[PDB]
Design a protein around this ligand. Structure first.
Ligand code: ATP
Ligand code: CA
Ligand code: MG
Lengths: 364, 123
């Protein structure tokens, strides 16, 4: 009996744990810190807390690894410090962003076998794991995390690459936007600790309005929509229509000076790229996943917008599980735990024999 | 993948039912076909013989109202795996308790029955 590990490499947060558990044992910032002017490096929470003397780097951008040296450090730390395991003793399932470059898939594979000596490994597409976690084989996943939002149509277990689309706007962008609009109210949140306060405000007080214009009129007319927030000292601030204007940017990217379509349109557009014969199944299975889909009211709003774009005879169904922030990781935990998983992973033998390119024939 | 039960799957016309039991696919005794635990997830393979001799397949993953996430997720994945094993010849159907398709319901001569309970989650 062997124990597999599951690692979901997010652009903002890494989720790591043991297959079979219903939640990741470790969730920490995907950051590597190094001495600013001169322990050689730090990772995660400790790097973040020691930023005063460290230069921080985020090796994953838009779900794609951009620095392999730093990524090795995150993984090294994940194994030895966060999970407290010897990697050479465990099969490892890693997640990847949709449309992850072929070169990157091979790299990840080579690092696991050559650097960490994993006895076996597998790479799964994040969106697909989320669909599985929701108990479905067909549907369209709208995965929105840190730097990017993806719309991924999946049919009978497999994503349809040609129809995968993306909005280059996600959580960090919403946090930065909240920072900006809060200044118009006369608040300055510029430092790292201050940006963290803004993120908390976004995560705790923001919500998606079903009807934005009407929500704006309401805010302007009364103080019904106002909420109070207490800063780390004791200063209490008041936030109004910023609560819903912040996440509104997901639906109206022009709010950030972006020309691309909002998430509801991107979802509709991905659906229209699929064979008419399966579109009914996509509209009826819109699965939301990722931290940025956690805003109250987002499912109701997605339902409304998609219903407006689709024929009136199309049944629209938005699935927004409460645990959707870890949906990708949970899907991985289940997959890695199946009695049939032992045959799907790339083993050391296979790697030794075929090399990194084996990933394209074992994981697709 | 080639699980022992996969080797048994879709060999001749008829119905086969397995229950997801702690991350594994377990056959359901034939005498109990139609009796579904509402706290469980199942995989049903309906094999129909075609004129040329080959078999037609319809894979249904049935989800009880109280089945745990590991069970419904496993049922969905085993369904993709079984289809893959069957050369992609199976049409997959998601069947939720209380909202099953006429086709699925029609597989049970006397009508299927629901019973509270089931095997514990594998998490
Ligand atoms: N309750 C919440 N309301 C709104 N946003 C939230 C909430 N909880 C977390 N977030 C946001 O979700 C983002 C992190 O999401 P997530 O963990 O899904 O991304 P990731 O894995 O790191 O990113 P990606 O998939 O882009 O690689 C951050 O911007 C964070 O502020
Ligand atoms: Ca059960
Ligand atoms: Mg993610």
């Amino acid at each position: 009996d062997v124990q597999a590990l599951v690692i979901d490499n997010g652009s903002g947060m890494c989720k790591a744990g043991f297959a079979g558990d219903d939640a990741p044992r470790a969730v920490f910032p995907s950051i590597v810190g190094r001495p600013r002017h001169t322990k050689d490096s730090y990772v995660g929470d400790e790097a973040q807390s020691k930023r005063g003397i460290l230069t921080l780097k985020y090796p994953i951008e838009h779900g794609i690894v951009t620095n392999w040296d730093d990524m090795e450090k995150i993984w090294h730390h994940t194994f030895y410090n966060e999970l407290r395991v010897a990697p050479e003793e465990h099969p490892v399932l890693l997640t990847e962003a949709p449309l992850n470059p072929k070169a990157n898939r091979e790299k990840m594979t080579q690092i696991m076998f050559e650097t960490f000596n994993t006895p076996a490994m597998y790479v799964a597409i994040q969106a697909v794991l989320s669909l599985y976690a929701s108990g479905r084989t067909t549907g369209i996943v709208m995965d929105s995390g840190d730097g990017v939002s993806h719309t991924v149509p999946i049919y009978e277990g497999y994503a349809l690459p040609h129809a995968i689309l993306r909005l280059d706007l996600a959580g960090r962008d919403l946090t930065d936007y909240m920072m900006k609009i809060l200044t118009e109210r006369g608040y300055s949140f510029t430092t790292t600790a201050e940006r963290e306060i803004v993120r908390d405000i976004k995560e705790k007080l923001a919500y998606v309005a079903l009807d934005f214009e009407q929500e704006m009129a309401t805010a302007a007319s009364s103080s019904a929509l106002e909420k109070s927030y207490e800063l780390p000292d004791g200063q209490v601030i008041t936030i109004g229509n910023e609560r819903f204007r912040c996440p509104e940017a997901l639906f109206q990217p022009s709010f950030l000076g972006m020309e691309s379509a909002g998430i509801h349109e991107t979802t509709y557009n991905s659906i229209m790229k699929c064979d008419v014969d399966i579109r009914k199944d996509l509209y009826g299975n819109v699965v939301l996943s990722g931290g940025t889909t956690m805003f109250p009211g987002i499912a109701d709003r997605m339902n409304k917008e998609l219903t407006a774009l689709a024929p009136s005879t199309m049944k629209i169904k938005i699935i927004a599980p409460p645990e959707r922030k870890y949906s990708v990781w949970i899907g991985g935990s289940i997959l890695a735990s199946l009695s049939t998983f032992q045959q799907m992973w790339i083993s050391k033998e296979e790697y030794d024999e075929s090399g990194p390119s084996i990933v394209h024939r074992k994981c697709f | 993948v080639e699980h022992p039960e996969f080797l048994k799957a879709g060999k001749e016309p008829g119905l086969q039912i397995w229950r997801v039991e702690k991350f594994d696919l377990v056959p359901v005794p034939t005498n109990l076909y139609g009796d579904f635990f509402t706290g469980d997830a199942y995989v049903i393979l309906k094999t129909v013989q075609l004129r040329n001799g080959n078999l037609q397949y319809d894979l249904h993953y049935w989800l009880g109202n109280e089945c745990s996430q590991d069970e419904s997720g496993a049922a969905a994945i085993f369904t993709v795996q079984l289809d893959d094993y069957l050369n992609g010849r199976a049409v997959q159907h998601r069947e939720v308790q209380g909202f099953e398709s006429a086709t699925f319901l029609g597989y049970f001569k006397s009508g299927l029955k629901y019973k509270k309970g089931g095997v514990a989650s594998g998490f």
